[PDB]
Amino acid sequence: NSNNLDSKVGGNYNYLYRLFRKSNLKPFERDISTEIYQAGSTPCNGVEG
Amino acid sequence: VKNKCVNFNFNGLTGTGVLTESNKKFLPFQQFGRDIADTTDAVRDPQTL
Amino acid sequence: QCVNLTTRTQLPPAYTNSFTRGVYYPDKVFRSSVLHSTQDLFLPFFSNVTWFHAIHVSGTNGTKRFDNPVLPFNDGVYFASTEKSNIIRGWIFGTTLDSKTQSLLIVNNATNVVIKVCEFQFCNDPFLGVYYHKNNKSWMESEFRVYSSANNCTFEYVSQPFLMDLEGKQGNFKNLREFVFKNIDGYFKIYSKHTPINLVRDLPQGFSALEPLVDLPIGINITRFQTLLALHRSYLTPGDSSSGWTAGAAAYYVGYLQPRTFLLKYNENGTITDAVDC
Numbered sequence: 001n002s003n004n005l006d007s008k009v010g011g012n013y014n015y016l017y018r019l020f021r022k023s024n025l026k027p028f029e030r031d032i033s034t035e036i037y038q039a040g041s042t043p044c045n046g047v048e049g
Numbered sequence: 050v051k052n053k054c055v056n057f058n059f060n061g062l063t064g065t066g067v068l069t070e071s072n073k074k075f076l077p078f079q080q081f082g083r084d085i086a087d088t089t090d091a092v093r094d095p096q097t098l
Numbered sequence: 099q100c101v102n103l104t105t106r107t108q109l110p111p112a113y114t115n116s117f118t119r120g121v122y123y124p125d126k127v128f129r130s131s132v133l134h135s136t137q138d139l140f141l142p143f144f145s146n147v148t149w150f151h152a153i154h155v156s157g158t159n160g161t162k163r164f165d166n167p168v169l170p171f172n173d174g175v176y177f178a179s180t181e182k183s184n185i186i187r188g189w190i191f192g193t194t195l196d197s198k199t200q201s202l203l204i205v206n207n208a209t210n211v212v213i214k215v216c217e218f219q220f221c222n223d224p225f226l227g228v229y230y231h232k233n234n235k236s237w238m239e240s241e242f243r244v245y246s247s248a249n250n251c252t253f254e255y256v257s258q259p260f261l262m263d264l265e266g267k268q269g270n271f272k273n274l275r276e277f278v279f280k281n282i283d284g285y286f287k288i289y290s291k292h293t294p295i296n297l298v299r300d301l302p303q304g305f306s307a308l309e310p311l312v313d314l315p316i317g318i319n320i321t322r323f324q325t326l327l328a329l330h331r332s333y334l335t336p337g338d339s340s341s342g343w344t345a346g347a348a349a350y351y352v353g354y355l356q357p358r359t360f361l362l363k364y365n366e367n368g369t370i371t372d373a374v375d376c
């Protein structure tokens with residue numbers, strides 16, 4: 001636990017996690033892309049909505 | 050200690066046996082030698098190489 | 099900085115046979131006078147291997163081949179190179195060879211060996227270029243057009259400086275160098291071997307076990323790879339940097355690894371001298 005170090009009174013938002021990936025990661029694989037994830041049939045054009 | 054029945058710990062690999070000078074020429078990426086029975090029958094000394 | 103090369107004659111792809119090449123040491127355990135059966139990603143014996151050239155044949159039409167296509171990376175690549183003037187300079191591996199994803203670059207800069215896993219906006223025609231000065235009668239590295247931009251660089255390695263003479267040697271291929279590239283569990287496994295050889299046309303016939311070279315902890319997705327070669331410029335071959343170039347004679351052969359069981363023979367000296375593809 002690192003609550004004494006990684007927590008801020010107003011909220012520490014510097015730590016990020018990946019949600020909405022197309023497929024599961026391979027073992028020891030790193031994905032740092034920031035492309036917009038398309039959940040529906042309508043295709044995105046770099047815009048969130 | 051050579052030419053004597055000793056317990057040995059070579060780079061974490063423990064065993065019992067007699068260590069003698071070998072004519073085998075290990076490749077630089079090789080540390081242990083194994084026979085047909087997969088037993089460690091040769092070892093490179095981590096200090097004297 | 100990206101330059102789109104032109105004046106390349108269109109030729110059908112070439113194919114050849116890999117007889118028994120591509121065998122590498124499965125592990126780092128010494129074995130002598132033994133027949134060891136092991137299952138691994140091996141290049142199948144007598145496999146259909148793609149063949150690429152780099153040559154500028156003098157003539158009216160002739161042939162001006164500079165083959166650096168984007169080839170698949172299915173499970174592992176056997177890459178052989180017959181060269182004499184150090185034309186094959188490296189490779190780039192990735193999925194989408196642009197800034198969207200991360201890519202690996204293993205290149206020879208004629209001074210250092212650079213291995214960078216990072217987000218590269220790779221050029222459509224990436225290459226290197228050596229200029230030949232008539233006054234000095236000397237060859238110097240002058241062009242590096244592999245990528246346009248590099249961002250979010252996670253892995254970097256630069257080797258110790260060297261010389262790597264860039265003279266455009268003429269005659270026979272004096273160097274066969276073989277690599278095996280694998281991408282397993284976030285590790286780029288590179289096995290390498292070098293043999294003198296002396297020929298002009300095809301992939302050498304024989305047996306030579308590849309030794310483990312490096313295990314890069316890159317942790318990236320790789321499905322495609324492109325070979326980076328070096329072209330030649332001098333007082334000859336005038337042009338606008340897209341036609342004013344010539345290709346030094348070189349060739350490289352690409353085969354693909356498959357999960358196979360091989361019976362390897364270790365002689366009394368611990369060297370893999372023969373193999374059987376079961």
Ligand SMILES: *[C@@H]1O[C@H](CO[C@@H]2O[C@@H](C)[C@@H](O)[C@@H](O)[C@@H]2O)[C@@H](O[C@@H]2O[C@H](CO)[C@@H](O)[C@H](O)[C@H]2NC(C)=O)[C@H](O[C@@H]2O[C@@H](C)[C@@H](O)[C@@H](O)[C@@H]2O)[C@H]1NC(C)=O
Nearest residue numbers: 013014015016032033034035197217247248249250251252
């Ligand atoms: C991955 O790359 C991002 C883009 O870097 C910027 O654009 C390049 C083309 C180049 O000009 C470079 O110098 C720029 O800095 C990094 O920056 C973030 O990009 C997002 C766009 O999706 C932007 O909203 C952020 O403001 C920007 N941050 C910074 C500090 O520039 C990424 O940096 C990390 O990821 C961000 C989501 C954010 O958490 C940032 O604080 C992080 O440092 C790069 N990601 C890595 C290196 O993991």
Ligand SMILES: *[C@@H]1O[C@H](CO)[C@@H](O[C@@H]2O[C@H](CO)[C@@H](O)[C@H](O)[C@H]2NC(C)=O)[C@H](O)[C@H]1NC(C)=O
Nearest residue numbers: 022023024025026029031192193194319320321
């Ligand atoms: C590694 O990269 C390949 C290619 O970029 C990914 O395969 C693609 O997967 C998407 C959906 O996941 C498909 O729409 C594409 O058609 C696929 N392309 C190819 C060439 O296969 C693969 O999913 C990636 N692997 C991981 C673990 O992310």
Ligand SMILES: CC(=O)N[C@H]1[C@H]([C@H](O)[C@H](O)CO)O[C@@](O)(C(=O)O)C[C@@H]1O
Nearest residue numbers: 230266267268330331332333334335344
């Ligand atoms: C970069 C360059 O121009 N190389 C040219 C060489 C060089 O002049 C000599 O290798 C060094 O003097 O000479 C050629 O006739 C040759 O041998 O094929 C043509 C070739 O284009």
Ligand SMILES: *[C@@H]1O[C@H](CO)[C@@H](O)[C@H](O)[C@H]1NC(C)=O
Nearest residue numbers: 060077093094095096097098
């Ligand atoms: C330490 O190990 C090295 C091998 O890397 C060896 O050359 C050297 O003699 C050793 N030193 C001692 C004091 O044993």
Ligand SMILES: *[C@@H]1O[C@H](CO)[C@@H](O)[C@H](O)[C@H]1NC(C)=O
Nearest residue numbers: 099100101102103221222223
């Ligand atoms: C080279 O040609 C390709 C053709 O698809 C093009 O996409 C690319 O932009 C060109 N490069 C330059 C530098 O013009």
Ligand SMILES: *[C@@H]1O[C@H](CO)[C@@H](O)[C@H](O)[C@H]1NC(C)=O
Nearest residue numbers: 112113114115145146147148
């Ligand atoms: C190798 O494959 C190509 C097409 O992929 C084919 O034309 C050629 O005949 C094949 N080689 C052999 C020896 O079958």
Ligand SMILES: *[C@@H]1O[C@H](CO)[C@@H](O)[C@H](O)[C@H]1NC(C)=O
Nearest residue numbers: 207208209210212239242256
């Ligand atoms: C190649 O790159 C290395 C590091 O990026 C650099 O030190 C070296 O000078 C370069 N060599 C060239 C540009 O010929």
Ligand SMILES: *[C@@H]1O[C@H](CO)[C@@H](O)[C@H](O)[C@H]1NC(C)=O
Nearest residue numbers: 229231232233234235236238
């Ligand atoms: C000749 O060599 C020197 C140093 O080796 C270099 O600075 C010079 O540019 C070369 N000549 C030409 C015409 O480039």
Ligand SMILES: *[C@@H]1O[C@H](CO)[C@@H](O)[C@H](O)[C@H]1NC(C)=O
Nearest residue numbers: 074364365366367368369371
């Ligand atoms: C094994 O090595 C020795 C000495 O290095 C050499 O004399 C012998 O010919 C080698 N054996 C084989 C089969 O290469």
